[PDB]
RNA sequence: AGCCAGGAUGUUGGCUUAGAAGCAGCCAUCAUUUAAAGAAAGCGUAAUAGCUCACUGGUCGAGUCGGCCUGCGCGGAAGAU
């Protein structure tokens, strides 16, 4: 009931883009605003709908006079669709035996077990135009659990013997576990569907793929919202297999001494990774355990937790989900989150090299004025193979500072090497040479040279432009059309180190090397480049840098 | 139409015609290159 | 000049009515008259029309340089005509001709149906293509440009009403 | 031969079957099956040891057709195939390394004389001396 | 100044080749044919396909073009019973 809504265009657009074979049945009457009839073509009857009511009439009439010929040229393509479905209707399309409403569906229903044609219907949901029409095809074009191939439990490891079991009540019990939601009443819940067999209330239902024992509690059905306790679950209902101790994605819900499934196909990868941070330090005690009931619900929600910084780095496949699981924490889990950046190796390096920085120390701490005017020379970040991140080349002029006071200057430099003048970014792996160490007697101690060395190191960084040693990820992107030229140009805004442009039968896969420091909102940006039309991989390879030049003014 | 005292022929294909007396300069594809005063 | 080296040849089938300054051209399907300025010296000499700038109005080389281009278009417009097709690229936008009226499916809360004057035989082969036919070169643009000014070419999608030969410059979002 | 429709000479070393991305567009001009230009030239590509850029030209036709002209590799890459390195032009008039006499230049010009009507022997001799001086190469006989 | 009009074609023009493939930028800055073509100006652009400047090669068939000096003119120019 919208402008530009041509029914015959879209069904005949599938034969061009999707490449399928749709033969539609319920056509259109009305110029989309005075629309009143939906043209079912098997029975050749138009249906009247409600003046504006939420559901009164179903009045069937004949084909109206304003579409007496388009019904003619389209019904003859309907009755084609059984002569090339079954071989037996081939000789009565041409011989001229009558192609009734009941005879043609007996061939076309068997054309849904192979799925070469889909059955299309135009109408309105909101204007109550078509919804009462759409239900009768479901019992005649959508398959039943007893008309399909039923539960097929193979074996375990012995031999590949796929066994079609019965769809009736006369089999060992069988179900599957999916849509396993949560609740603050019982904890874990499920939305499971039983394919055949009957269970009573109270059972030792196992999960036979992961070797765990569970007991079957009080099962509850819904109107999608309201608790209705379903005691006796019949073959084919959908309910809540409650009280499972541990349960994974798609394992069996089955009594022992019975057939057994072991099947988990297409385990996904949540791609976009944002790092959640608590508000109070009482929150991390309850945000460390947030992974418990949340990640148990679904495999499209991962947490790539770090090894050092101990922040909680989540992983989603869409930020649109990483919206929601924060909002799931908000009013019911009662969490105040401060969503920030993931743990990228931010090891401050150095662009410029300071010549000499003297730590100014002068204080009568221990009686006499403990001096300590020691000077260090900013040495280039030690490269190649350097296991120790602290490379203090203590160059005492003529071994002047004694061994007792060597730890002093060492400690000061080490303290600021692990710290960072930007946001506490470790200036590690940076070799540092001592220029000259002033030494005394009553004016020589630990603080004497420790405090001095501390300031000296920081002073140097202000005139050494510390940049950022950064990890580089192997980023691949799969995009079908010639819209990747805007992508790889916009990828060139982000130091994506290009490898090559390659193609597939439908996709143009681009190969690049992107800084992990330059991830930020990568997912939401390509999703506005690719329009969300992208399915690709993420790996790691090199390690490079990302521009900072913050020592100039930003760094105090 | 941006206004400034200087009409400088800036774009490579920049027409200049004196409509009403005040000069306004006519590009083809760039709307940014069109001034009006001077 | 170039215009002085440009005389116009009237053919058989279009009659001129030279009452000096006022010329009313009796043509094929209309009457294309222009009451020119007094900076012209007109003479349908033998068959090919010759003109002239009057003294005093020595800037009439311009004022009749309009006229030399003018009447050439008039004798070929009253007979052959102008095809002025417009391309409607709009989401749910249609075009349909009835009598001398054009509909405008233009994304509004109310329909716009404007009546179009004489010198117009409009047509519509489809909802996005619309013919206009006419005799004056002015009137075949003036009624066309009014529609285009109701929905100018949008340079972020290519949305709008646009001419057949006109080629827009659509940009990209580049931020979000 | 033909006119304002299409004429570009671009092909690089024919050991690579898949059209290299920058060459792609000269095959992305008038609607080719890119498998056809892969299957046209490989019947004669097995008479070479690959490694040099061999050139072809493209030229088009009305409906879905096309055509192409096979020649021999140019002497510009033949200068830097014998010299070992493929790129020597860092400073033209300040590098004096590497000699090949005129006798090598004419025997890579007979394969031009047996292939093409331009790029003649004696006229290209100063330009095969001219691609030497820009690369920083010497010549004596 | 416009319509036909080839944009004659050696080459990938390197470097560093991931594309820096005349069209990112530094050194060369020759030209196989010179009645028409430069190892080159922008747009298309990761690169190029598309579209031109280059000579207008063929038509119009006469004047035309870019700056220097002065006579004056326009814009610049918005204020408070």
Swiss-Prot record, chain A:
Subcellular location: Cytoplasm
EC numbers for this chain: 3.6.5.-
GO cellular component: cytoplasm; cytosol
Predominant cellular place of this UniProt entry's protein: cytoplasm
Modified-residue entries (N6-acetyllysine), positions: 360, 499
Catalytic activity field: GTP + H2O = GDP + phosphate + H(+)
EC supergroup of this enzyme: hydrolase
Gene Ontology terms describing biological process: ribosome disassembly; translational elongation
Molecular function per GO: GTP binding; GTPase activity; guanosine tetraphosphate binding; translation elongation factor activity
Keywords: Acetylation, Cytoplasm, Elongation factor, GTP-binding, Hydrolase, Nucleotide-binding, Protein biosynthesis
Keyword Protein biosynthesis: yes
Similarity section: Belongs to the TRAFAC class translation factor GTPase superfamily. Classic translation factor GTPase family. EF-G/EF-2 subfamily.
Function comment: Catalyzes the GTP-dependent ribosomal translocation step during translation elongation. During this step, the ribosome changes from the pre-translocational (PRE) to the post-translocational (POST) state as the newly formed A-site-bound peptidyl-tRNA and P-site-bound deacylated tRNA move to the P and E sites, respectively. Catalyzes the coordinated movement of the two tRNA molecules, the mRNA and conformational changes in the ribosome.
Protein name per the record: Elongation factor G
Organism: Escherichia coli (strain K12)
Gene behind this protein: fusA
Curated annotation (Swiss-Prot), chain B:
InterPro entries assigned to the protein according to its UniProt record, in alphabetical order: Ribosomal_bL36, Ribosomal_bL36_sp
A GO biological process held by the record: translation
Record keywords, A-Z: Ribonucleoprotein, Ribosomal protein, RNA-binding, rRNA-binding
GO CC terms of this entry: cytoplasm; cytosolic large ribosomal subunit
GO molecular function, a single term: rRNA binding
Pfam families in alphabetical order: Ribosomal_L36
Highest taxon of the lineage: Bacteria
PANTHER family: 50S RIBOSOMAL PROTEIN L36, CHLOROPLASTIC, LARGE RIBOSOMAL SUBUNIT PROTEIN BL36C
Cited function: One of the last ribosomal proteins to be assembled in the 50S subunit, it contacts a number of helices in the 23S rRNA, acting as molecular glue. The simultaneous presence of uL16 and bL36 probably triggers ObgE's GTPase activity and eventual dissociation from the mature 50S ribosomal subunit.
Family per similarity comment: Belongs to the bacterial ribosomal protein bL36 family.
Subunit relationships: Part of the 50S ribosomal subunit.
Record protein name field: Large ribosomal subunit protein bL36A
Organism annotation: Escherichia coli (strain K12)
Curated annotation (Swiss-Prot), chain C:
Protein family (similarity comment): Belongs to the universal ribosomal protein uL6 family.
PANTHER family (UniProt xref): 60S/50S RIBOSOMAL PROTEIN L6/L9 (PTHR11655), LARGE RIBOSOMAL SUBUNIT PROTEIN UL6M (PTHR11655:SF14)
Entry protein name: Large ribosomal subunit protein uL6
Originating species: Escherichia coli (strain K12)
Ranges in a coiled coil: none
Any one Gene Ontology cellular component term annotated for this protein: cytoplasm
Keywords for the protein's UniProt record, in alphabetical order: Acetylation, Antibiotic resistance, Ribonucleoprotein, Ribosomal protein, RNA-binding, rRNA-binding
Residue ranges of the TM segments: none
Curated annotation (Swiss-Prot), chain D:
Quaternary context: Part of the ribosomal stalk of the 50S ribosomal subunit. Interacts with L10 and the large rRNA to form the base of the stalk. L10 forms an elongated spine to which 2 L12 dimers bind in a sequential fashion forming a pentameric L10(L12)2(L12)2 complex.
Cellular component aspect of the GO annotation: cytoplasm; cytosol; cytosolic large ribosomal subunit
Domain of life: Bacteria
GO biological process per UniProt: cytoplasmic translation; ribosomal large subunit assembly; stringent response; translation; translational termination
Gene for this chain: rplK
Record PTM N6,N6,N6-trimethyllysine, positions in chain: 3, 39
Entry keyword RNA-binding: yes
Keywords: Methylation, Ribonucleoprotein, Ribosomal protein, RNA-binding, rRNA-binding
Modified residues (N,N,N-trimethylalanine): 1
Name of the protein this chain belongs to: Large ribosomal subunit protein uL11
């Amino acid at each position: 009931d919208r402008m530009g809504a041509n029914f015959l265009k879209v069904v005949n657009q599938i034969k061009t883009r999707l490449g399928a074979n749709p033969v539609p049945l319920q056509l259109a009457i009305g110029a989309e605003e005075h629309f009143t009839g939906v043209v079912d073509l098997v029975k050749m009857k138009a249906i009247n709908w409600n003046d504006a009511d939420q559901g009164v009439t179903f009045e069937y009439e004949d084909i109206p006079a304003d579409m007496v010929e388009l019904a003619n040229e389209w019904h003859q393509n309907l009755i084609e669709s059984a002569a090339e479905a079954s071989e037996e209707l081939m000789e009565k399309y041409l011989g001229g035996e009558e192609l009734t409403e009941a005879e043609i569906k007996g061939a076309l229903r068997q054309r849904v077990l192979n799925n070469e044609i889909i059955l299309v219907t135009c109408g309105s949901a909101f204007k109550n135009k078509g919804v009462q029409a759409m239900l009768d095809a479901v019992i005649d074009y959508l398959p039943s659990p007893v008309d399909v191939p039923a539960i097929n439990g193979i074996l375990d490891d012995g031999k590949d013997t796929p066994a079609e079991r019965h769809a009736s009540d006369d089999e060992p019990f069988s179900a599957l576990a999916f849509k396993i939601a949560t609740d603050p009443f019982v904890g874990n819940l499920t939305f499971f569907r039983v394919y055949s067999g009957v269970v009573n209330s109270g059972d030792t239902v196992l999960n036979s793929v992961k070797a765990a024992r569970e007991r079957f509690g009080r099962i509850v059905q819904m109107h999608a919202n309201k608790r209705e306790e379903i005691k006796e679950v019949r073959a084919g209902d959908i309910a809540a297999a409650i009280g499972l101790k541990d349960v994974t994605t798609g394992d069996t819900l089955c009594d022992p001494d019975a057939p057994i499934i072991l099947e988990r196909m297409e385990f996904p990868e949540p791609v976009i990774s944002i790092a959640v941070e608590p508000k109070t330090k009482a929150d991390q005690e309850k945000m460390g355990l947030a992974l418990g009931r949340l990640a148990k619900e679904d495999p499209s929600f991962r947490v790539w937790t770090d090894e050092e910084s101990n922040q909680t780095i989540i992983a989603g496949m869409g930020e649109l989900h990483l919206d929601i699981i924060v909002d799931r924490m908000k009013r019911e889990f009662n969490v105040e989150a401060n969503v920030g950046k993931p743990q990228v190796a931010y090891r401050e390096t150095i662009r410029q090299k300071v010549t000499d920085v003297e730590g100014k120390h002068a204080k009568q701490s221990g009686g006499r004025g403990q001096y300590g005017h020691v000077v260090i020379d900013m040495y280039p970040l030690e490269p190649g193979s350097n296991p120790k991140g602290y490379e203090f080349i203590n160059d005492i002029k003529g071994g002047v500072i004694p061994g007792e006071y060597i730890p002093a200057v060492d400690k000061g430099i080490q303290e600021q090497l692990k710290a960072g003048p930007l946001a506490g970014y470790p200036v590690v792996d940076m070799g540092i040479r001592l220029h000259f160490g002033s030494y005394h007697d009553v004016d020589s101690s630990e603080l004497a040279f420790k405090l001095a060395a501390s300031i000296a190191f920081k002073e140097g960084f202000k005139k050494a432009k510390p940049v950022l040693l950064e990890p580089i990820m192997k980023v691949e992107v799969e995009t079908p059309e010639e819209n990747t030229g805007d992508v790889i140009g916009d990828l060139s805004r982000r130091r994506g180190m290009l490898k090559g442009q390659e193609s597939e039968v439908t996709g143009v896969k681009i190969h690049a090397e992107v800084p992990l420091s330059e991830m930020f909102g990568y997912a939401t940006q390509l999703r506005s480049l690719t329009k969300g039309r992208a399915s690709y991989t993420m790996e790691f390879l090199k390690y490079d840098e990302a521009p900072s030049n913050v020592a100039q003014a930003v760094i105090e | 139409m941006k206004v400034r005292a200087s009409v400088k022929k800036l774009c490579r294909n920049c027409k200049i015609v004196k409509r009403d007396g005040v000069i306004r300069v006519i590009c083809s594809a760039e709307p940014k290159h069109k001034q009006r005063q001077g | 000049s170039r215009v002085a080296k440009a005389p116009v040849v009237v053919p058989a089938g279009v009659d001129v009515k030279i009452n000096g300054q006022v010329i009313t051209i009796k043509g094929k399907n209309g009457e294309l008259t222009r009451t020119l300025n007094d900076a012209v010296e007109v003479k349908h000499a033998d068959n090919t029309l010759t003109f002239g700038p009057r003294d005093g109005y020595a800037d009439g080389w311009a004022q009749a340089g309009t006229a030399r281009a003018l009447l050439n278009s008039m004798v070929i417009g009253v007979t052959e005509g102008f095809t002025k097709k417009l391309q409607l690229v709009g989401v749910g936008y249609r075009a349909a001709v009835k009598g001398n009226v054009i509909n405008l499916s233009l994304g509004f809360s109310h329909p716009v149906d404007h009546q179009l004057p004489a010198g117009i035989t409009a047509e519509c082969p489809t909802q996005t293509e619309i013919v206009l036919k006419g005799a004056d070169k002015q009137v075949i643009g003036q009624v066309a440009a009014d529609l285009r000014a109701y929905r100018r070419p949008e340079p972020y999608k290519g949305k709008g009403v646009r001419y057949a030969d006109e080629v827009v410059r659509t940009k990209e979002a580049k931020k979000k | 031969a033909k006119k304002v429709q299409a004429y570009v000479k671009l092909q690089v070393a024919a050991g690579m079957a898949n059209p290299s991305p920058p060459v792609g567009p000269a095959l992305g001009q008038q609607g080719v099956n890119i498998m056809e230009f892969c299957k046209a030239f490989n019947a004669k590509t097995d008479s070479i040891e690959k490694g040099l850029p061999i050139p072809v030209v493209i030229t088009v036709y009305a409906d879905r057709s096309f055509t192409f002209v096979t020649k021999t590799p140019p002497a510009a890459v033949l200068l830097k195939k014998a010299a070992g390195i493929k790129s020597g032009s860092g400073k033209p008039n300040k590098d004096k390394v590497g000699k090949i006499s005129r006798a090598q230049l004419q025997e890579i010009a007979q394969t031009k004389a047996a292939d093409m009507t331009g790029a003649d022997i004696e006229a290209m001799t100063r330009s095969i001396e001219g691609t030497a001086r820009s690369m920083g190469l010497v010549v004596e006989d």
